[PDB]
Amino acid sequence: LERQKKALGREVALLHKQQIALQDKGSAFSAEHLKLQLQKESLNELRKEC
Amino acid sequence: VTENECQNYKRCLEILEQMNEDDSEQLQMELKELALEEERLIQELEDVEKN
C-alpha cells in the first residue's frame, strides 16, 4: 500500500504540471493566431496603398 | 556427553515448566482484529489502484 501510494503521488504531481503547461500553450496559440489575423489585414491595406 | 545432554534436557524442561498456556479468547480477538485490518487494507489498495 505504502509503495503504491508513493507512486500515485508522483503521478498526480506530474499530471498537474502537464495540465498547467497545456493551458499556457493554448493561451499562447490563441494570441499568436489573433496577431496573424491583424497582420494580414494590415498587409492588405499596404497593398492598396502601393 | 550423554549426561550433559540429559542435564540440558532437564534445564529445558524447567524453562517449559515456568511457562503457562495462553488463553484462546485473546487469540480469537486478535485474529478477528487482523481479519478486519486485512479487509480494510484490501479496500484501500483497490481504491489506490483505481485512482
Side-chain angles (χ1 to χ4, degrees), chain A residues 3-49:
Chain A
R3 99 176 186 71
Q4 291 298 345
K5 174 156 50 50
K6 292 167 186 173
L8 175 56
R10 281 179 278 179
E11 288 169 339
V12 161
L14 182 163
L15 178 89
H16 153 282
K17 168 179 178 177
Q18 280 184 333
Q19 277 200 324
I20 287 171
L22 193 77
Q23 293 291 355
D24 287 349
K25 300 151 44 187
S27 76
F29 171 58
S30 69
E32 292 291 319
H33 213 207
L34 180 141
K35 175 182 177 182
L36 174 57
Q37 297 165 239
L38 292 171
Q39 284 285 269
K40 281 198 166 186
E41 293 167 10
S42 188
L43 175 58
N44 287 332
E45 293 290 307
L46 274 37
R47 267 195 179 96
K48 324 303 314 203
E49 177 170 335

Side-chain angles (χ1 to χ4, degrees), chain B residues 26-41:
Chain B
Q26 309 311 136
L27 300 181
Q28 282 174 79
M29 181 183 136
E30 164 167 85
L31 197 150
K32 292 310 209 301
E33 189 165 302
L34 292 166
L36 171 153
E37 194 76 8
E38 179 184 50
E39 290 293 4
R40 200 185 72 259
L41 288 169

